[PDB]
């Protein structure tokens, strides 16, 4: 089971961005997280995403975009990739996609997007994992015991961002 995180130019998620994704204040960032796995019963949730000046994801940051599945930033939008008659590239790959609006909060030309995923079970009883919870369900209710359970099986990803100033 392999996982990847990629940034795209637009909300069409057609063209993965070459090099270091470059962004300015009030521009959007388009994020796709993916997993190539054999077990159909295996899923994942986007647990937490944040931006930091530090390459180390253990470093604390106050620019939090998603916190425990539910988005914290008001600009977050989720996109479907599992829509009938709406094909996406690479079928063998299961994906979750979202976007956010970049806000000027740091004073650096280089930032890191850090996202952690947690594993989940798509079908009852098959896997030793909690059931998958959508962002909408988590916002209405999600408790500490479930969060602790999800955190037991998690993978973190990091991509750099080049921050440009503009008039």
């Amino acid at each position: 089971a392999t996982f990847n995180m990629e940034l795209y130019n637009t909300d069409l998620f057609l063209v993965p961005s070459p090099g270091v994704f470059s962004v300015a204040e009030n521009e959007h960032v388009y994020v796709e997280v993916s997993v190539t796995k054999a077990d159909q019963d295996l899923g994942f949730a986007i647990q937490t995403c944040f931006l930091s000046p530090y390459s180390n994801p253990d470093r604390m940051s106050d620019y939090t975009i998603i916190e425990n599945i539910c988005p914290k930033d008001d600009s977050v939008k989720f996109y479907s990739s599992k829509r009938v008659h709406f094909p996406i590239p690479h079928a063998e790959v299961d994906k979750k996609r979202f976007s956010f609006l970049f806000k000027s909060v740091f004073n650096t030309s280089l930032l890191f997007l850090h996202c952690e995923l947690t594993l989940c079970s798509r079908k009852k009883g098959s896997l030793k994992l909690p059931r998958c919870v959508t962002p909408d369900d988590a916002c209405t209710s999600l408790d500490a015991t479930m969060i602790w359970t999800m955190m037991q099986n998690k993978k973190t990803f990091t991509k750099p961002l080049a921050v440009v100033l503009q008039h």
Binding site: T48, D58, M60, E67, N68, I69, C70, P71, K72, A138, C139, L142, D143, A144, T145, I147, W148, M151
Partner: protein
């Protein structure tokens, strides 16, 4: 009772409660607990008679602050604080 009142006065090699502060981010890697920064979890250790082991007996919960989206949540996480030990 192999609790703090006995064990912290009679410091010894046999099975007893041991004091231990844990910092969530620094010691456990639990980044999602906003408050407290840490707490006294303690642990159980020491020799036992006769093949038994020194292990926890009474455990207590810990009140934590975490977030879901922008919603602050306060809850009592069970099984966080070791209060007494037993040979088993």
């Amino acid at each position: 009772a192999l609790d703090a009142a006995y064990c912290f006065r009679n410091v010894q090699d046999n099975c007893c409660l041991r004091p231990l502060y844990i910092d969530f981010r620094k010691d456990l890697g639990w980044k999602w607990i906003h408050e407290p920064k840490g707490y006294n979890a303690n642990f159980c250790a020491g020799a036992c008679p006769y093949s038994p082991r020194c292990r926890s007996q009474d455990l207590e919960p810990l009140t934590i602050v975490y977030y879901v989206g922008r919603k602050p949540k306060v809850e009592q996480l069970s099984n966080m604080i070791v209060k007494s030990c037993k040979c088993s």
